[PDB]
Design a protein around this ligand. Structure first.
Ligand SMILES: CC(C)C[C@H](NP(=O)(O)O[C@@H]1O[C@@H](C)[C@H](O)[C@@H](O)[C@H]1O)C(=O)N[C@@H](Cc1c[nH]c2ccccc12)C(=O)O
Ligand SMILES: CCCCCCCCOCCOCCOCCOCCO
Ligand SMILES: [Zn+2]
Length: 371
């Protein structure tokens, strides 16, 4: 039990020191690189027991484990929401305000935060009661049904999100008739993309930052770029579809989900895993998920994150190359420079920090490839 606890905590500190090291190398570049390089002249000018206590003053005794688990889920997410709030306010209303990006008031910010928290609970708790029940009621192969249920939930959520969740938080409007709407339609036909409707999301209610999303096409209103540049960026986006990157990501995530539920099944009988974290008299299923998925699986989670980051960089070069294929390299080149400027991206990075962290290859590497 001591080896387990100690190893989780030492791994945490080790990752933290590695990431502090990397961050320092990147911060050094910001303080050091004080004029435009020549490669760039043309590019820029306890809680558990507390939850039981709430349960028993409402008339629910310890035998009601899922109930206590749902209380814990509420308090844990509330605690994390509350401790994140000072930081999010400072980033939005000091950093983002200072550099010209924030567009929202404090009242919008708090309305938004409460709504996101409520909607999260509306989905999280019912789904959690069922998943926990499934785990309890189906071994020795419970993990197959646990996996299948999370796959179905994931599928439902993704299928309803556009119509039923997203409009609670953002304003979507059809792209107006004009020259851009028609060239998008031409391009979509050209690749057999069954384009249905083009929408514009009013991101400017929040921020002047811009970002294109991956059926329907949704474009930020802050995306700005002239029409031929929007089209090359769409060309790139549609490359993620033609090349099957989205399907590969879905398969990876469900294979990973299968593997973790299997290993959870292997490990969840080990009472030493619970004792490591102060659970002596009981082994609640949810606490089990927490310990195994977040603490015990720690090294695997880190290696996989890193592997997905490398893969992501590879997919981005491939999507750029698909837009080149479509004949849009010159416009994509232009588009990436202008978005880098509107969003104030700094186009020099430390090679180690960027290898570890960047899901998108540095701008200069993307421009060279488009040439
Ligand atoms: C051609 C480009 C305008 C659109 C293109 N979008 P795309 O790569 O297809 O997809 C984006 O990146 C993926 C990693 C994510 O999984 C997606 O959710 C999405 O954020 C892109 O290169 N996005 C980069 C570049 C970028 C767009 N807006 C930004 C704002 C700040 C910094 C960088 C950007 C990004 O996500 O960052
Ligand atoms: C006995 C092994 C310690 C070797 C690695 C040092 C870990 C330091 O990271 C701490 C960073 O996080 C700040 C909060 O933790 C402070 C306590 O760290 C003391 C490490 O013994
Ligand atoms: Zn992309």
């Amino acid at each position: 039990e001591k080896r387990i606890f100690g190893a989780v905590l030492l791994f945490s500190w080790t990752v933290y020191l590695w990431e502090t090291f990397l961050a320092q190398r990147q911060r050094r570049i910001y303080k050091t690189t004080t004029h435009v390089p020549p490669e760039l002249g043309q590019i820029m000018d306890y809680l558990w027991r507390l939850s039981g206590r709430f349960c028993g003053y409402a008339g629910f005794g310890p035998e009601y484990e899922i109930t206590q688990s749902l209380v814990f889920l509420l308090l844990a997410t509330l605690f994390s929401a509350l401790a994140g709030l000072p930081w999010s306010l400072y980033n939005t209303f000091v950093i983002e305000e200072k550099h010209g990006f924030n567009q929202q008031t404090l009242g919008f910010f708090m309305k938004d935060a409460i709504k996101k928290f409520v909607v999260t609970q509306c989905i999280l708790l019912p789904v959690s009661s069922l998943l926990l029940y499934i785990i309890k009621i189906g071994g020795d192969y419970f993990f197959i049904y646990a996996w299948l249920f999370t796959l179905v939930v994931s599928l439902v959520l993704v299928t309803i999100y556009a119509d039923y969740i997203a409009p609670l938080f953002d304003k979507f409007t059809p792209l107006p008739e004009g020259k851009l709407k028609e060239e998008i339609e031409v391009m979509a036909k050209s690749i057999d993309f069954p384009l249905t409707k083009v929408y514009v999301v009013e991101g400017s209610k929040r921020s002047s930052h811009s970002n294109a999303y991956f059926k329907r096409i949704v474009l930020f209103d802050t995306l700005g770029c002239k029409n031929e540049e929007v089209l090359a960026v769409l060309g790139h986006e549609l490359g993620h579809w033609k090349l099957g990157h989205t399907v590969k990501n879905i398969i990876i995530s469900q294979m990973n989900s299968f593997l973790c539920f299997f290993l959870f099944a292997v490990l969840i009988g080990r009472k030493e895993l619970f004792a490591a974290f102060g659970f002596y008299d009981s082994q609640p299923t949810l606490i089990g998920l927490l310990i195994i998925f977040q603490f015990i699986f720690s090294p695997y989670n880190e290696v996989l994150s890193f592997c997905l980051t490398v893969l992501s960089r590879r997919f981005e070069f491939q999507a750029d190359a698909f837009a080149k294929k479509l004949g849009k390299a010159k416009d994509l080149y232009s588009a990436l420079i202008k978005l880098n400027k509107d969003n104030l991206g700094f186009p020099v990075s430390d090679w180690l920090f960027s290898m570890w962290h960047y899901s998108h290859p540095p701008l200069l590497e993307r421009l060279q490839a488009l040439k």
